[PDB]
Design a protein around this motif. Sequence first.
Motif, PDB file in Angstrom:
ATOM      1  N   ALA A 219     -22.563   7.083 -11.326  1.00  0.00           N
ATOM      2  CA  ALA A 219     -22.586   7.850 -12.751  1.00  0.00           C
ATOM      3  C   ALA A 219     -21.195   8.414 -12.974  1.00  0.00           C
ATOM      4  N   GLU A 220     -20.424   8.938 -11.995  1.00  0.00           N
ATOM      5  CA  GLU A 220     -19.456   9.574 -12.231  1.00  0.00           C
ATOM      6  C   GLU A 220     -18.200   8.753 -12.648  1.00  0.00           C
ATOM      7  N   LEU A 221     -18.216   7.393 -11.957  1.00  0.00           N
ATOM      8  CA  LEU A 221     -17.548   6.289 -12.278  1.00  0.00           C
ATOM      9  C   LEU A 221     -17.517   5.895 -13.739  1.00  0.00           C
ATOM     10  N   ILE A 222     -18.617   5.717 -14.267  1.00  0.00           N
ATOM     11  CA  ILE A 222     -19.055   5.178 -15.455  1.00  0.00           C
ATOM     12  C   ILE A 222     -18.364   6.196 -16.436  1.00  0.00           C
ATOM     13  N   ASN A 223     -18.803   7.679 -15.948  1.00  0.00           N
ATOM     14  CA  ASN A 223     -18.613   8.869 -16.884  1.00  0.00           C
ATOM     15  C   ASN A 223     -16.975   8.780 -16.850  1.00  0.00           C
ATOM     16  N   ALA A 224     -16.226   8.914 -15.884  1.00  0.00           N
ATOM     17  CA  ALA A 224     -14.743   9.150 -15.705  1.00  0.00           C
ATOM     18  C   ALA A 224     -14.116   7.932 -16.663  1.00  0.00           C
ATOM     19  N   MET A 225     -14.735   6.665 -16.531  1.00  0.00           N
ATOM     20  CA  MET A 225     -14.190   5.638 -17.587  1.00  0.00           C
ATOM     21  C   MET A 225     -14.424   5.701 -18.812  1.00  0.00           C
TER      22      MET A 225
ATOM     23  N   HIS B  45     -12.310   4.039 -23.315  1.00  0.00           N
ATOM     24  CA  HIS B  45     -13.402   3.758 -24.188  1.00  0.00           C
ATOM     25  C   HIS B  45     -14.083   2.353 -24.230  1.00  0.00           C
ATOM     26  N   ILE B  46     -14.073   2.027 -22.861  1.00  0.00           N
ATOM     27  CA  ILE B  46     -14.912   0.685 -22.862  1.00  0.00           C
ATOM     28  C   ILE B  46     -16.280   0.716 -22.929  1.00  0.00           C
ATOM     29  N   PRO B  47     -16.772  -0.568 -23.398  1.00  0.00           N
ATOM     30  CA  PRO B  47     -18.471  -0.672 -23.341  1.00  0.00           C
ATOM     31  C   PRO B  47     -19.205  -0.057 -21.904  1.00  0.00           C
ATOM     32  N   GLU B  48     -19.665   0.887 -21.959  1.00  0.00           N
ATOM     33  CA  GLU B  48     -20.297   1.633 -20.680  1.00  0.00           C
ATOM     34  C   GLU B  48     -21.265   0.743 -20.145  1.00  0.00           C
ATOM     35  N   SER B  49     -21.880  -0.329 -20.764  1.00  0.00           N
ATOM     36  CA  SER B  49     -22.550  -1.442 -20.134  1.00  0.00           C
ATOM     37  C   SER B  49     -21.865  -1.892 -18.922  1.00  0.00           C
TER      38      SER B  49
END
Length: 63
Positions: free
Chosen positions: A15-21, A26-30
Amino acid sequence: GSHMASTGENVISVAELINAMKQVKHIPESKLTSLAAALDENKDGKVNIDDLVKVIELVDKED
Ligand SMILES: [Ca+2]
């Protein structure tokens, strides 16, 4: 067992990795969550930071 992040590198969570990125890019969070969960060997929600750097180094490779 002990196979990933054998570099002795730190660990971040999915979650922190997806959050950071999500905020530093602004890449597709999927893809972000899927990649984190793919790097999450234990499927525990925590991913080694080594994994991020190595996956980028591997993605860095042109083909
Ligand atoms: Ca894990």
